[PDB]
């Protein structure tokens, strides 16, 4: 019944699973997420060595600012974490991870997402390549 949640979980799960081991939002996410991971690999390595992933997600947003860059960066860091779990043979944490990321995003930022027209806003914001 939460169709926004359902749709966010499918994109984020599929991205995390694919990286590790709607169609238009996925193509946007994989492209922008690859730039983010490639360009911030050392920061992401540093961060990985440290679900309080949840507290950190929310703390990103504490200054009262929400934007697609912060969102896509969080999801990208989730894919980075997912690829590590695959490397380390702990794929069973990948789905709880995607669930956690979706929960935190939809739970805390549902009003903002609605206002930005959901994943349609995401695709439009990143359209210029």
């Amino acid at each position: 019944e939460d169709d926004l949640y359902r749709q966010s979980l499918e994109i984020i799960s599929r991205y995390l699973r694919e990286q590790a081991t709607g169609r238009r939002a996925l193509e946007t996410l994989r492209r922008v997420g690859d730039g983010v991971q490639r360009n911030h690999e050392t920061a992401f390595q540093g961060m990985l060595r440290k679900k309080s992933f949840s507290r950190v997600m929310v703390h990103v947003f504490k200054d009262g600012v929400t934007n697609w860059g912060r969102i896509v960066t969080l999801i990208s860091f989730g894919a980075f974490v997912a690829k590590h779990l695959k490397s380390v043979n702990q794929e069973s944490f990948i789905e709880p991870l995607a669930e956690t990321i979706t929960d935190v995003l939809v739970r805390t930022k549902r009003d903002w997402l609605v206002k930005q027209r959901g994943w349609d806003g995401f695709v439009e914001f990143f359209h210029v390549q």
Binding site: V60, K62, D63, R70, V72, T73, L74, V128
Partner: peptide, 19 residues
């Protein structure tokens, strides 16, 4: 959290520059 926030705003700013 500071790191993800600043990276996220750098990505956002780049895309608004592109847009």
């Amino acid at each position: 959290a500071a790191x993800l926030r600043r990276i996220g705003d750098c990505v956002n700013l780049r895309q608004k520059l592109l847009n």
